[PDB]
Amino acid sequence: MLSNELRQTLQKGLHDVNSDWTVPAAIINDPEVHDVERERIFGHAWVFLAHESEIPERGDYVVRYISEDQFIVCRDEGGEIRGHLNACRHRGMQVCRAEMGNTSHFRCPYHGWTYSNTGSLVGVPAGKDAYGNQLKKSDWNLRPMPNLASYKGLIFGSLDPHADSLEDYLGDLKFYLDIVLDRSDAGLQVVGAPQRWVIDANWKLGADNFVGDAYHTMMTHRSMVELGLAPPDPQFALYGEHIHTGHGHGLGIIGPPPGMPLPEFMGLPENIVEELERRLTPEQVEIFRPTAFIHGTVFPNLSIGNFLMGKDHLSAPTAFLTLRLWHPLGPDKMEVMSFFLVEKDAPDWFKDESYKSYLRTFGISGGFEQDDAENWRSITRVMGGQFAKTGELNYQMGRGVLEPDPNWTGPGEAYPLDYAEANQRNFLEYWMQLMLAESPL
Template sequence: MAKGKAAMGAKEVPRALQELAQGLEEGLVPAGILNDPEVFAWEQERIFARSWIYLGHASEIPSPGDYVLRYILNNAFILVRGEDGRVRALLDMCRHRGMRVCRAEAGNASHFRCPFHGWTYRNDGTLVGVPAEREAFGEGFRKEAWGLLPIPRLEEVDGLLFGNLDPEAPSLEEWLGGAKWYLELVTKRSPEGLEVLGPPQRFVVPTDWKLALETFISDSYHTLMTHRSMIELGIAPRDAKYAMYGEQIHIPGKGHGAMVVGGPPGAKLPPFWGYPAEMMERAQASYPTREQWEVAKETRIFLLTLFPNFSLHNPIRKPDHLYPTPVPMLTFRVWHPLGPGRIEVISWGMVEKDAPEWFKEKARHSYLRFFGSSGTFEQDDTEIWSHVAQNAGSTLGRRLRFNYQMGRNVPQDPNWPGPGVAYPINFTDENLRNFYRRYLELMLG
């Protein structure tokens, strides 16, 4: 552990991180990495200050002046499309005395005015107005030197906007690596791309950000019990082992992971998530490679998590109890840490821009019914996450080590057509072990 200690200077490596480094390859993860103030302080410095974080989708701000407020840790950014059409992320902090200059979560504005002393900025961040400028600051005051601070890095891939607090960070493309192939299964499904189904839902959960994303990067196993009521109500498949069928894939050295779920042999399921025939035809022509189409047409449920805290989920569900046919829904979500053992879930409903209007409405209903603050699956998950985080922060509980040994002996799938390392079953913790390898690399490297 000397390397980790040297990297952090005088700071000693937290005990939980030492235990994680010692036990990970055996599939042993200490409860103490969840809901721990010292570990979270390291995460702020070593993970979130250096990683690409999802901020929003370009369709949220389609016109000049459109803006939304978004966050990386405790940094608030105005994600805004300027009058020149360019998208920027500006720190919501007046350069004079530090007050927030944007008082709404979303809107349209050509300028932002600080309510403290009235300094006024164009939506490109340029300072253009200083009350009593000559009297207060004299001749020669250089407003051009006092504009809003832009985020160090902002990049876009297929309409998804990511920010990074580290000016020396690798490019977004390098950060994604082979995960871009899997992201394109969703973003390239239509030549028109995606759009948001309204503003995101936001809700606070007393849990750890890592615990939340685990469900979306690897844990099909929890569906057997956590969502048992959905099975009993006929909302989820009667075959409780349905979630095991498919592939689990991770990108070595990156921390990203995907689950591609098909169905049991002989299952009567529609191809290509159940999307309408017209959308299937467009997708077949839109995908960059034939291999992506071959994977997509056999997929019924798809999950992807990009390190550190962005997940997407694309299942097929009935939008309401009267509608006879399951409809695919797509959600993006950010597990935004507010502190140790506390997160804000930011959850978007998404759909293809060129989808039929009836389909967009059904997809929206499906999303609201199952995910978001009132979603049935979401409520199942968040209750569990809350109790696990509470136990992990307890005096005795934090001393325990959790079992992440599932699937250690499962052979890889040599015939998987996509990038990364694939396993022909979703009942494995390999994606989680890969996630924590990358986590340790950044925390201790």
């Protein structure tokens, strides 16, 4: 149950988010918030696990998470995608202690119960001598992820057997995910593995940032503005669109100003442009055509960056795509999992260039993200104070001014600029609704 203090705070916040346009500060770094959130958000929402291109062959697996629960995500010997809790049904040992690999079977080191990558318990040592053949193996298969599904290569799981389908949960966001995920015939590939590392910050600060925040560029990334890597125009995000959807999802799309021609479709290779013109609807094509930046968050904790950027201060920019998890470790700690993706049929020159543009800007050593990380840890630290927590966060950007764009051709609630905090407010409104749900939804 919620403490009365937490309940009241959430109730007040649910009113404040659309009137004052503020949110209680107590949500950022608080042990009760984190414990309630674990069940109410991470025990119900759909959470990104893996991209299908990470496990392309039969027997391929990666080990991924919903909070502290560990799951084997694999392609089984029949070609089916599975998600198995990594806990032997006998005494709970990990049946896989690697981060990824390929195997036809998972053998528990403790007593040797042997599972197919299908999940089926197929082998029990001393089945006769110890169990008298009484043990019904099909009752002790690896425990499945209660809900597992894919959208365009992205594997999600939910801990709730009664969750809405993934497609309903994504809803109108699907239109925009297509623009990033479905451009090419052969599809996207994760190159190598994600960068994983620990930031002493709450996971929400990363989600909040990618869901709607272009504003921070001018100050947080001022060093990059000076080096010529970030947009120099302080008005850059006025040439864009701020979009949100049901279930907390939101994104922004920014293009160049009228007096700046940039190659269409983020300068993607010719063969990819051919394919996207035929794979996406005309409405999706025209939204994508003048894009320079796409940032968004799929509630709760998967963010997307599709950005056009130089690999150093002397280079012309190239497009790169990254997906990242803000994996919750504690009220004041997360593990970032940052993935670099590129179209499988992109020429090798473009894959290398895109990789470098991603690498020097984002990720653990990127010149942008390293400052983002410093901001989030700083917030988290001061937001652990009892007095600091009685305050509010200001999401008032646009208050008294924002009007929906009547001319936007895509679904969702859209505003004709990308200096706004409507997406962040929508993200935290869904968060608060889930926190207050005594029964799901």
